From Swiss-Prot:
Name by which UniProt lists this protein: La-related protein 1
Protein localization: Cytoplasm; Cytoplasmic granule
Highest rank taxon of the organism: Eukaryota
Post-translational modification: Phosphorylated on multiple Ser and Thr residues in response to active mTORC1. Phosphorylation is important for interaction with RPTOR and the mTORC1 complex. Phosphorylation promotes dissociation from the 5'UTR of mRNA molecules with a 5'TOP motif.
Described purpose of this protein according to its UniProt entry: RNA-binding protein that regulates the translation of specific target mRNA species downstream of the mTORC1 complex, in function of growth signals and nutrient availability. Interacts on the one hand with the 3' poly-A tails that are present in all mRNA molecules, and on the other hand with the 7-methylguanosine cap structure of mRNAs containing a 5' terminal oligopyrimidine (5'TOP) motif, which is present in mRNAs encoding ribosomal proteins and several components of the translation machinery.
Homology family: Belongs to the LARP family.
Induction (record text): Up-regulated in a number of hepatocellular carcinoma cell lines and liver cancer lesions, as well as in patients with hepatocellular carcinoma with a lower survival rate (at protein level).
HTH La-type RNA-binding domain: residues covered: 4-91
Record text about domains: The C-terminal region mediates interaction with the mRNA and polysomes. It is required for translational repression of mRNAs with a 5'TOP motif. The N-terminal region mediates interaction with PABPC1.
Subunit note: Interacts with PABPC1/PABP. Interacts with EIF4A1. Interacts with RPTOR. Recruited to the active mTORC1 complex via interaction with RPTOR. Inhibition of mTORC1 activity strongly reduces interaction with RPTOR and the mTORC1 complex. Identified in a complex with mRNA, PABPC1, EIF4E and EIF4G1. Found in a complex with PABPC1 and SHFL.
Amino acid sequence: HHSQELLKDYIKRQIEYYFSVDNLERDFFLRRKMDADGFLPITLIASFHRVQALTTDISLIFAALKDSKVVEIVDEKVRRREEPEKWPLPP
């Protein structure tokens, strides 16, 4: 539906904010959960308050992120496309 495309757009922009440089410079929790290549489980992102308010439908979260030039998906993990390896921190 148009409703579902609109919701996908809000989800997309919310998660793109988490992976923005502006957020990453202060988001020590997110960086501590990255693996050494920058990847995080998409299901971890799904638990964040502003995403979980919008949806609990994991297919909708994946579909929103397929549409993104900010992030890259491999299987069930997601990372910032640009220089992701610079951001991980010790757990």
